[PDB]
Amino acid sequence: SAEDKAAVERSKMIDRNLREDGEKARRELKLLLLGTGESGKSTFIKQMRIIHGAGYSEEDKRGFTKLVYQNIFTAMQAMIRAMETLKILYKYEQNKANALLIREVDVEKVTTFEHQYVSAIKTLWEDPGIQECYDRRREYQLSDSAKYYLTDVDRIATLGYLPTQQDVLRVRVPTTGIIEYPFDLENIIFRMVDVGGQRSERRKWIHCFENVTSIMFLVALSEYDQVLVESDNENRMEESKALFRTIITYPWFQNSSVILFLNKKDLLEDKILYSHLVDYFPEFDGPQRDAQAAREFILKMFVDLNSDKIIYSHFTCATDTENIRFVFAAVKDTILQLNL
Amino acid sequence: AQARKLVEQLKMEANIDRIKVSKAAADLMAYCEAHAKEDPLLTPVPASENPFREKKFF
Amino acid sequence: RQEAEQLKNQIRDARKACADATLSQITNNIDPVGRIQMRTRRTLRGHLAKIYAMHWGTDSRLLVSASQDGKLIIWDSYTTNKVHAIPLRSSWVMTCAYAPSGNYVACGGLDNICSIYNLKVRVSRELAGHTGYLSCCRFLDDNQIVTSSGDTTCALWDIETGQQTTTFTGHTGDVMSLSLAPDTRLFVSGACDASAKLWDVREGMCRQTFTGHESDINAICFFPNGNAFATGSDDATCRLFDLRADQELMTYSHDNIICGITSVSFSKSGRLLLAGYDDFNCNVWDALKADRAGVLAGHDNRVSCLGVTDDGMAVATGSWDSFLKIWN
Numbered sequence: 133s134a135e136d137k138a139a140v141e142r143s144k145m146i147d148r149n150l151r152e153d154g155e156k157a158r159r160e161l162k163l164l165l166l167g168t169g170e171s172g173k174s175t176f177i178k179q180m181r182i183i184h185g186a187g188y189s190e191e192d193k194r195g196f197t198k199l200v201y202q203n204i205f206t207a208m209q210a211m212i213r214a215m216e217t218l219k220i221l222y223k224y225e226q227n228k229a230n231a232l233l234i235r236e237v238d239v240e241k242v243t244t245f246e247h248q249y250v251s252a253i254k255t256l257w258e259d260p261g262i263q264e265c266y267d268r269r270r271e272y273q274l275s276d277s278a279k280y281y282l283t284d285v286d287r288i289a290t291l292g293y294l295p296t297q298q299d300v301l302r303v304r305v306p307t308t309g310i311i312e313y314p315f316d317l318e319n320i321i322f323r324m325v326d327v328g329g330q331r332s333e334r335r336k337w338i339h340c341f342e343n344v345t346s347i348m349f350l351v352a353l354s355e356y357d358q359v360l361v362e363s364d365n366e367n368r369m370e371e372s373k374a375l376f377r378t379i380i381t382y383p384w385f386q387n388s389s390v391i392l393f394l395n396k397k398d399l400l401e402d403k404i405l406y407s408h409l410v411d412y413f414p415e416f417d418g419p420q421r422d423a424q425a426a427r428e429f430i431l432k433m434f435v436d437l438n439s440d441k442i443i444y445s446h447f448t449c450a451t452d453t454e455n456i457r458f459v460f461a462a463v464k465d466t467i468l469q470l471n472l
Numbered sequence: 473a474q475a476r477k478l479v480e481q482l483k484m485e486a487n488i489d490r491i492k493v494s495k496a497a498a499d500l501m502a503y504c505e506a507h508a509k510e511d512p513l514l515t516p517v518p519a520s521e522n523p524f525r526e527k528k529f530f
Numbered sequence: 531r532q533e534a535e536q537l538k539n540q541i542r543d544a545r546k547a548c549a550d551a552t553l554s555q556i557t558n559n560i561d562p563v564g565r566i567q568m569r570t571r572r573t574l575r576g577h578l579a580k581i582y583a584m585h586w587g588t589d590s591r592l593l594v595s596a597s598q599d600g601k602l603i604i605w606d607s608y609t610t611n612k613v614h615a616i617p618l619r620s621s622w623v624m625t626c627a628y629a630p631s632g633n634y635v636a637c638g639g640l641d642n643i644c645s646i647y648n649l650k651v652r653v654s655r656e657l658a659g660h661t662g663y664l665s666c667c668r669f670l671d672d673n674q675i676v677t678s679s680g681d682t683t684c685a686l687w688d689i690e691t692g693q694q695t696t697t698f699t700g701h702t703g704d705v706m707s708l709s710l711a712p713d714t715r716l717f718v719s720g721a722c723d724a725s726a727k728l729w730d731v732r733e734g735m736c737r738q739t740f741t742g743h744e745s746d747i748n749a750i751c752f753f754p755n756g757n758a759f760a761t762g763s764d765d766a767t768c769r770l771f772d773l774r775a776d777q778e779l780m781t782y783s784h785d786n787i788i789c790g791i792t793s794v795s796f797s798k799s800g801r802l803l804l805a806g807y808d809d810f811n812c813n814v815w816d817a818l819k820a821d822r823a824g825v826l827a828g829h830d831n832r833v834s835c836l837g838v839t840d841d842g843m844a845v846a847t848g849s850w851d852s853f854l855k856i857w858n
C-alpha cells in the first residue's frame with residue numbers, strides 16, 4: 133500500500149537521522165563539575181565560554197546587569213545578618229534604618245538599583261561596625277566577590293552601567309536546575325555539567341551521571357581556616373574532602389577520569405599572611421605566611437584518602453582567564469589522551 | 473501559622489465518610505470479575521485477534 | 531499542636547473502625563490466576579542511551595519514549611515504524627506523556643521545565659515555574675497538563691498562558707510520580723516523604739494522605755475503576771490503597787527481592803499489578819490474592835518504565851539498556 137510504503141520510508145529517514153546524531157554523540161565528552169558552593173564551578177564554566185566559546189558581547193553583558201545588583205544586595209544582607217549573629221554594633225544610628233531597608237529587599241524581584249538603596253548600601257559599607265563584620269567573614273558565609281562589587285558600587289550605580297567581563301565572571305547566576313555548557317574544541321564537543329544549583333534529593337538523579345567521561349572537582353584553598361560549628365567544628369576543607377572521597381569511591385565513577393582543581397589560590401596568598409594553617413591543621417610542618425607550603429600541604433591532605441586511580445591535580449585561580457587557559461590546555465590533553 | 477495550616481488539613485482529612493474494608497474489597501473483587509473476559513493479559517486471546525501476532529503488521 | 535494530635539489519632543481510630551476484614555480474607559476462596567507467561571512480541575530499537583520513561587497513546591498502538599540520548603521517539607508498535615524523533619534541548623529527561631488527542635507530547639527532567647511539542651515538530655510551550663526536577667507529567671487534554679516535581683509540589687498548568695492554574699502543596703519530599711483518575715477530577719501523587727496524596731484537581735486541596743512505611747514512592751497508578759491505586763517504592767514493595775475505606779489493603783513483596791521499584795500499572799481488569807524493578811525484571815502480581823503470577827525477563831539493565839495499553843492487549847517495558855519491549 134502507498135501509505136504503508138511512505139510510513140516505512142519515514143521510519144528509515146528517522147533511523148538515518150538517529151545514526152547521524154549517534155555519530156556526533158560519540159564525539160561528545162561530558163565533564164561533570166562537582167564541589168561545594170562557592171568553590172568556583174560556575175566561574176570555570178564562564179571561562180570556557182570566554183576561552184573556547186562565543187564569549188560575552190555587549191548585549192550578553194546587559195543580561196547580567198540585574199544579577200550584579202542582586203549580588204550587592206545578597207552580600208550586604210549577609211553582613212547585616214552577621215552583625216546580629218556576632219553581636220556587632222553599628223556606629224551610625226541611621227544604619228538601623230538603612231539595614232532594615234536592605235534586609236527587606238526581595239532579591240529575586242530586583243531589576244533596578246535606585247538611589248536610596250545605593251545610598252543605604254554605601255552608608256552601611258562605610259560603617260566601622262560593618263567593616264569589623266567584614267573582617268570577621270571567616271566566621272560566617274560571605275561571597276569572595278562581595279568586596280569587589282561594594283568597592284565598585286559607584287560604577288555599578290551609574291546611569292548606563294554595562295557589566296565588565298570581570299563583573300560577569302564574578303556574578304551569581306541563580307538557578308535550581310541543571311547547568312550544561314557545551315563547547316567545540318578540536319572536533320570534540322565538551323559538555324560541561326554543573327548540578328550545584330539543584331536543591332532536590334541527589335539519590336533520585338545521581339544515576340543520570342553513570343560513567344561520565346570526567347569529574348572535575350573544585351575545592352576553595354581559601355577555606356582552610358573555616359569550620360562547621362554544626363558538624364562538631366569540622367573544617368570546611370575536611371567536608372569538601374569527604375564529599376570528594378564519596379565521589380571518587382562511587383561505583384559508577386570508577387571509569388571516569390578525576391581532575392582536582394585547588395582553586396582560589398590568589399585568596400590563599402592573601403589569607404596566609406595573617407591566618408596560620410597550623411592553627412587548623414596542627415600536623416602542618418611548613419613555615420608560616422608561606423602560600424606555597426600551604427597549598428602543597430592542602431593538596432597532599434586532600435588526596436590522602438585511605439585506589440590505583442590517578443588524580444590529576446592543578447592549582448587554579450578561576451577568575452584569571454590566562455590561568456584557566458593554561459591549566460585547561462593541560463587538562464584537555466589528559467582527557468583526550470585517556471578517551472581516544 | 474504553619475501549625476494552624478496542618479490542623480485545618482487534618483480536620484479536612486478526618487471528616488470523610490469511610491466504608492468497611494469488607495465492602496471496599498467486595499467491590500474490587502466484583503470489578504475484576506466483571507471485566508475478566510475483556511482483559512487480554514489475564515485471559516490470552518486467539519493469535520488471530522492479537523495485533524502483535526498478526527502477519528499483516530510484522 | 532495538641533489539636534493536631536487529637537486529629538491524627540481520630541483518623542487512625544476511624545480507619546481501624548472500618549477494618550472489619552482484609553482483602554486477602556475476602557479473596558481467599560477465588561481461583562488463582564495461574565502462571566502468566568507473556569512473550570516478547572516487539573523489540574523497539576533506536577535509543578542510544580538509557581530510557582527513563584514511556585507513555586502509550588490512547589489508540590493502543592503509538593507510544594512515546596524518552597531517553598538520555600536527548601530524543602523522544604514516537605513509535606508505531608504494530609509495525610515498529612518510527613513516526614517521529616524529537617531532539618530535546620535538555621537530554622536530562624525523566625518523564626514523557628502522550629496527550630489523549632494524539633496531537634501533543636510532553637517531557638522534561640533536570641531542566642525543571644515541562645516542554646510541550648506539537649506533532650501536527652517543534653517545541654510549542656515551555657512550562658516554567660517548578661524549582662526542582664520534573665518527575666512526571668500527564669495531559670488532561672490539549673489545554674491542561676499536571677506535573678510532579680522534585681520541588682515537593684505538583685501543579686496544573688494552562689498550556690496556552692503557560693501559568694500554573696493550581697499548585698498542589700503538602701508533600702514534604704520530592705514528588706516522583708502521579709496518576710490521573712479515569713475521569714480526571716482527582717489525581718494521586720507519590721513522594722520521597724513516603725506518602726501518597728489524593729488531590730482534587732479543580733479545588734486544589736489534598737483530600738486524603740496514605741503512608742507507605744517510610745520508603746520513597748517512585749511510581750503510582752490508579753486501579754481501573756478509580757476507587758483505589760497502587761504504589762511502587764524503594765523498599766521492593768508494591769502497595770494497594772483503597773480511597774473509600776481510606777487505608778492500605780495489601781502489600782506485594784518477596785523477601786528475596788530487595789531492589790527498588792521504578793514503575794507500576796494495572797492490567798485492564800485490575801486483576802494483575804505489573805511492576806518494574808531495578809534487577810532488570812518486571813514482576814506480575816495477582817492484585818487480589820498477592821501471589822506473584824509471572825515475570826517479564828527481557829532486559830539487560832533496570833526496567834525504568836512500563837505501560838499497559840488502553841485496550842489491554844499489550845504491556846510495554848522500557849529500560850536503561852536502551853530498548854523497549856512489547857509483551858503479551
Ligand SMILES: Nc1nc2c(ncn2[C@@H]2O[C@H](COP(=O)(O)OP(=O)(O)O)[C@@H](O)[C@H]2O)c(=O)[nH]1
Nearest residue numbers: 169170171172173174175277301302396449450
Ligand atoms: N578571587 C577569586 N575569586 C574566585 C575564584 N574562583 C571563583 N571566584 C569567585 O568566587 C565566587 C564563588 O565562585 P563560583 O564560581 O560562583 O562557585 P560555585 O558556587 O561553585 O559556582 C564568585 O564570585 C567567583 O567569581 C578564584 O580563584 N579567585
